[PDB]
Amino acid sequence: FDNTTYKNLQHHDYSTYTFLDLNLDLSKFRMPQPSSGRESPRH
Amino acid sequence: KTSFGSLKDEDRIFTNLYGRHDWRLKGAQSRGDWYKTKEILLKGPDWILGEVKTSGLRGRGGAGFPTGLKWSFMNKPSDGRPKYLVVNADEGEPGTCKDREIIRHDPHKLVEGCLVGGRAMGARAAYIYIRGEFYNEASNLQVAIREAYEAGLIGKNACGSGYDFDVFVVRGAGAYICGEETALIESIEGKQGKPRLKPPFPADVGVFGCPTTVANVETVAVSPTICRRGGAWFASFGRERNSGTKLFNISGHVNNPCTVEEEMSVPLKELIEKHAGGVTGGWDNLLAVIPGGSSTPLIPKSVCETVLMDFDALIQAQTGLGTAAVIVMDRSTDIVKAIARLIEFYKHESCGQCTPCREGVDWMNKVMARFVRGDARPAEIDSLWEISKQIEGHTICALGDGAAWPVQGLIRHFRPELEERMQQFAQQH
Amino acid sequence: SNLIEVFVDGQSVMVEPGTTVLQACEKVGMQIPRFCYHERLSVAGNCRMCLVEIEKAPKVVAACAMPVMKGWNILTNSEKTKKAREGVMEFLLANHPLDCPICDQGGECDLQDQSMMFGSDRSRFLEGKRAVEDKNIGPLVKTIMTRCIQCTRCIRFASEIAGVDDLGTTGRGNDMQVGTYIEKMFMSELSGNIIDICPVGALTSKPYAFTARPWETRKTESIDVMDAVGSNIVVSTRTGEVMRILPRMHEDINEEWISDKTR
Amino acid sequence: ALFVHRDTPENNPETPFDFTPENYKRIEAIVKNYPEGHKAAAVLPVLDLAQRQNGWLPISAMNKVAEILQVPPMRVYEVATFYTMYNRKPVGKYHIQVCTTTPCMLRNSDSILEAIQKKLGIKVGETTPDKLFTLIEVECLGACVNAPMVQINDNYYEDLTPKDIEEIIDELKAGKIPKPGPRSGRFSCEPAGGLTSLTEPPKGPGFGVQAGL
Numbered sequence: 010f011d012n013t014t015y016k017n018l019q020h021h022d023y024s025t026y027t028f029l030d031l032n033l034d035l036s037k038f039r040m041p042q043p044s045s046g047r048e049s050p051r052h
Numbered sequence: 053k054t055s056f057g058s059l060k061d062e063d064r065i066f067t068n069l070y071g072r073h074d075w076r077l078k079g080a081q082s083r084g085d086w087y088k089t090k091e092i093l094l095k096g097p098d099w100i101l102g103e104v105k106t107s108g109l110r111g112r113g114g115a116g117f118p119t120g121l122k123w124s125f126m127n128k129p130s131d132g133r134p135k136y137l138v139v140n141a142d143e144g145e146p147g148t149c150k151d152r153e154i155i156r157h158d159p160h161k162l163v164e165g166c167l168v169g170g171r172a173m174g175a176r177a178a179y180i181y182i183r184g185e186f187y188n189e190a191s192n193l194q195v196a197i198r199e200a201y202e203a204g205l206i207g208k209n210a211c212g213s214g215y216d217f218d219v220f221v222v223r224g225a226g227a228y229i230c231g232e233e234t235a236l237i238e239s240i241e242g243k244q245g246k247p248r249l250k251p252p253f254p255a256d257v258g259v260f261g262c263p264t265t266v267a268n269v270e271t272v273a274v275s276p277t278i279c280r281r282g283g284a285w286f287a288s289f290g291r292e293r294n295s296g297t298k299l300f301n302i303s304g305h306v307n308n309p310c311t312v313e314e315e316m317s318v319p320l321k322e323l324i325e326k327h328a329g330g331v332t333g334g335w336d337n338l339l340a341v342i343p344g345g346s347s348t349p350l351i352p353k354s355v356c357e358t359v360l361m362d363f364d365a366l367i368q369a370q371t372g373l374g375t376a377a378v379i380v381m382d383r384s385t386d387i388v389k390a391i392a393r394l395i396e397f398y399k400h401e402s403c404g405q406c407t408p409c410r411e412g413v414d415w416m417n418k419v420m421a422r423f424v425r426g427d428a429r430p431a432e433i434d435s436l437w438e439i440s441k442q443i444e445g446h447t448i449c450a451l452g453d454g455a456a457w458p459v460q461g462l463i464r465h466f467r468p469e470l471e472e473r474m475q476q477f478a479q480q481h
Numbered sequence: 482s483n484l485i486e487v488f489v490d491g492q493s494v495m496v497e498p499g500t501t502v503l504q505a506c507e508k509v510g511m512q513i514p515r516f517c518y519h520e521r522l523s524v525a526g527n528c529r530m531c532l533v534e535i536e537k538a539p540k541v542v543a544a545c546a547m548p549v550m551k552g553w554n555i556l557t558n559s560e561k562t563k564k565a566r567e568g569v570m571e572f573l574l575a576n577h578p579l580d581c582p583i584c585d586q587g588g589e590c591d592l593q594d595q596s597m598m599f600g601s602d603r604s605r606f607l608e609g610k611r612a613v614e615d616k617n618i619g620p621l622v623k624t625i626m627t628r629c630i631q632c633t634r635c636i637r638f639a640s641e642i643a644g645v646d647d648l649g650t651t652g653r654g655n656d657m658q659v660g661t662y663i664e665k666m667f668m669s670e671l672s673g674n675i676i677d678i679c680p681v682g683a684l685t686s687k688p689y690a691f692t693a694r695p696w697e698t699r700k701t702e703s704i705d706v707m708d709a710v711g712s713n714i715v716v717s718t719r720t721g722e723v724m725r726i727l728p729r730m731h732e733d734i735n736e737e738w739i740s741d742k743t744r
Numbered sequence: 745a746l747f748v749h750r751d752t753p754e755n756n757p758e759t760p761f762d763f764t765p766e767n768y769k770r771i772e773a774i775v776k777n778y779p780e781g782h783k784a785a786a787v788l789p790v791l792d793l794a795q796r797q798n799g800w801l802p803i804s805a806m807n808k809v810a811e812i813l814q815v816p817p818m819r820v821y822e823v824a825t826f827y828t829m830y831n832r833k834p835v836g837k838y839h840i841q842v843c844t845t846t847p848c849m850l851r852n853s854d855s856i857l858e859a860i861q862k863k864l865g866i867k868v869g870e871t872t873p874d875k876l877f878t879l880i881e882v883e884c885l886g887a888c889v890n891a892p893m894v895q896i897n898d899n900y901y902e903d904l905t906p907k908d909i910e911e912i913i914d915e916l917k918a919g920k921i922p923k924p925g926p927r928s929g930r931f932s933c934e935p936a937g938g939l940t941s942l943t944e945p946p947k948g949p950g951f952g953v954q955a956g957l
């Protein structure tokens with residue numbers, strides 16, 4: 010058991026598209042979205 | 053109980069607050085997260101809401117509303133629209149940085165809280181609105197969410213309970229006002245972060261016009277542990293109607309500014325010296341404390357001597373717990389300049405939608421700037437007090453109140469300083 | 482059967498559910514002051530001039546947006562209501578420009594008139610005022626946007642009545658500005674109606690500019706012949722000359738709008 | 745800063761901008777996060793993505809976002825001018841953002857701001873002639889217990905002193921990127937000079953679980 014070091018070092022290597030790459034990576038898991046029934050409020 | 057604030061480590065909820073253990077799924081599980089999540093989900097929303105109610109949990113976002121009752125507005129038959137949980141991670145209140153630590157060091161507690169809290173509300177998904185400056189924190193949360201998806205803890209058949217739940221992360225673009233619950237919803241919908249009038253309340257017409265509950269990160273993140281250990285365990289900490297543990301941020305003029313978890317109702321002096329290492333220059337050097345973020349009125353040293361940190365105690369002290377972000381100011385502080393900077397902050401953050409804050413807060417900012425230099429007359433102090441009362445209670449959202457209260461606190465306890473500055477300026481001109 | 486009972490200053494009124502506090506007051510002939518509210522636009526609730534006290538309620542409510550509850554007693558003339566109106570009016574006038582003599586709205590201005598009736602009689606604003614640059618939106622509507630009180634009536638009219646999403650707010654806080662952001666012309670066949678709905682002299686008729694004051698015009702109620710709709714109009718004349726054309730409300734024909742050719 | 749747009753040679757509707765093909769894949773995933781019929785919800789993330797590709801937002805970038813999501817251009821201009829993180833004019837390679845609100849002001853954020861201005865030879869709100877750094881002040885960045893602090897692009901640098909901020913600039917100016925986080929010796933938000941809580945090993949699964957679950 011160590012309590013002396015910092016275990017949150019991954020974010021030192023994050024890049025400009027890191028957040029959006031993960032979001033794209035997650036699309037395969039999402040349940041199908043619900044539909045309001047039209048294309049947009051102006052349709 | 054009469055004394056509070058010697059919380060044991062075994063009773064602490066955010067056990068990776070300092071990021072000294074693996075923040076990822078393997079470490080989170082080793083620390084008790086995600087344990088028996090299926091059983092909680094199978095107990096049903098009424099059981100989950102019952103636990104949240106008996107814990108006496110209150111909103112940790114700054115308003116302190118009873119969580120169990122608030123979450124119960126969503127327990128109703130579906131009318132065809134989807135139901136959503138929106139988790140507030142906007143963290144904009146100056147002095148407050150607690151939600152940042154949860155998001156980056158205990159992300160799996162927040163994700164599990166979203167599933168448990170979402171189940172009680174009947175929501176199909178959780179939208180986590182995190183401020184856009186927290187880029188690295190948001191990426192940590194997304195990494196944790198990907199881990200949970202791949203282990204089946206969320207998504208279709210979450211934790212094997214047959215409940216489908218998605219967790220989305222949406223980033224802001226730089227607006228303190230987007231922490232307000234209806235402004236947050238409008239921001240998620242792609243508009244300016246301008247609050248909505250109420251009614252309708254979000255539980256009826258919310259994000260995308262659908263039933264919605266907005267919950268602070270800390271309020272959500274503790275819900276799985278309240279369910280596992282029970283509301284009675286949580287309610288055994290702090291005074292009645294002030295239950296549980298709380299994350300505190302001690303910044304300003306203290307030897308060791310820090311974030312720490314402590315029991316609700318701990319003495320303010322006890323908190324500052326046990327955890328922050330005391331006031332810079334010793335307790336006698338203390339001038340004033342803002343006990344709950346920039347929106348709560350300051351209290352002077354005399355009040356700080358014996359005030360407890362909970363919703364009721366600080367209200368009786370003519371302030372509020374707020375986010376429990378303690379800003380400390382010692383005798384070397386220009387107190388007028390310190391508050392003026394907060395009014396300047398609220399001037400920069402006001403959405404501009406409604407008249408008393410769009411015009412009033414900018415007006416108060418101009419008066420405070422002259423008060424800093426002493427370039428005013430003593431009659432203007434009562435004018436400024438009256439102006440702040442014309443903003444409070446007359447605006448769409450509470451940002452207007454949050455700008456008036458700091459001014460009222462300064463006039464309440466530091467009028468002679470304001471008048472002394474005016475004398476100096478007049479004497480020199 | 483479906484009506485519920487509310488009180489306006491202790492006077493019982495039966496209203497359908499969904500009726501706002503402002504609408505309930507209209508039923509007893511009391512007109513709540515307003516700026517952002519227009520009965521033909523979506524409810525905005527941003528000017529706060531309609532704040533009114535509900536008996537046994539600590540917080541005043543926006544009468545234009547708040548639906549009335551059973552048994553409420555709306556106190557339209559209480560001290561709490563009067564002080565809310567004075568405070569809101571004080572904030573509206575803090576940055577408003579001293580333009581009345583040169584401003585075409587003068588004499589038929591809702592800001593002037595509600596200041597007289599519901600606001601204080603003096604200023605305690607000791608600072609400098611805001612000033613914003615003007616926007617060119619065409620040859621029909623002159624904009625003096627320092628006079629704008631950010632009521633968003635023009636935005637809501639353009640989007641909802643005219644179906645043109647060209648107007649909006651840019652910026653934040655005290656710097657929030659109504660306009661098009663880019664240089665654009667608001668040239669729609671119903672565009673001239675934003676002159677009427679703008680409560681202040683921020684939007685004014687360019688052809689009409691500086692030619693007359695409201696109190697001196699004679700009003701002839703007449704009919705429009707530029708199309709076959711038959712829009713009801715008022716012809717404003719002075720000393721035997723036609724000065725302008727205004728809409729005349731007719732619910733079954735043109736409501737309270739006219740086309741730009743008619744105007 | 746002005747909240748009206750005037751066309752110029754460097755920033756007009758014909759200024760060239762389009763998302764890269766890879767960024768169109770990222771846009772598709774963004775739009776799928778929201779209910780069908782509510783694509784306007786993607787304005788903020790997509791507008792921010794256009795900035796992450798181009799560095800700032802020309803009016804042509806705002807027009808493209810409106811076109812892709814089928815929203816009126818004015819509704820995108822409203823968002824772009826409402827949120828402070830959108831750069832409506834070019835910024836330097838390194839956008840230095842110094843928090844100067846009261847919690848940071850109490851811990852001497854003015855010294856940090858003066859240190860940066862002295863080193864870069866620019867005033868707050870300016871860009872260096874090399875166009876490597878832009879300097880501005882910002883409101884609370886949510887790291888008050890680590891004051892004084894700055895944000896450079898996506899990274900926080902906290903517990904700063906004039907010496908520490910000069911080293912960070914020297915590293916960015918030298919092509920390297922410095923490590924984010926506190927520079928005072930501590931790792932994150934724990935009190936300096938030793939922990940006061942969470943000193944014992946955390947309990948394991950099932951600890952303190954109520955009966956009947």
Ligand SMILES: Cc1cc2nc3c(=O)[nH]c(=O)nc-3n(C[C@H](O)[C@H](O)[C@H](O)COP(=O)(O)O)c2cc1C
Binds near residue numbers: 271
């Ligand atoms: C100007 C303003 C900013 C706010 N910012 C936050 C915030 O950053 N985080 C938060 O949880 N609540 C914030 N709130 C409070 C929320 O509106 C809301 O009360 C809270 O998120 C409800 O969640 P809770 O019951 O768990 O506290 C803010 C309110 C105002 C008026």
Ligand code: SF4
Binds near residue numbers: 247401407410448
């Ligand atoms: S009080 Fe201020 S921030 Fe809140 S809606 Fe009104 S103008 Fe916007």
Ligand code: SF4
Binds near residue numbers: 577579581586
């Ligand atoms: S809009 Fe009304 S109050 Fe303002 S300058 Fe014109 S006439 Fe005077």
Ligand code: SF4
Binds near residue numbers: 679
């Ligand atoms: S220009 Fe006139 S109608 Fe439009 S927001 Fe300003 S005051 Fe209201």
Ligand code: FES
Binds near residue numbers: 531546
């Ligand atoms: S008329 Fe009700 S807030 Fe404007």
Ligand code: FES
Binds near residue numbers: 843
């Ligand atoms: S006051 Fe600077 S990070 Fe909060």
Ligand SMILES: [K+]
Binds near residue numbers: 586682683684
């Ligand atoms: K007008």
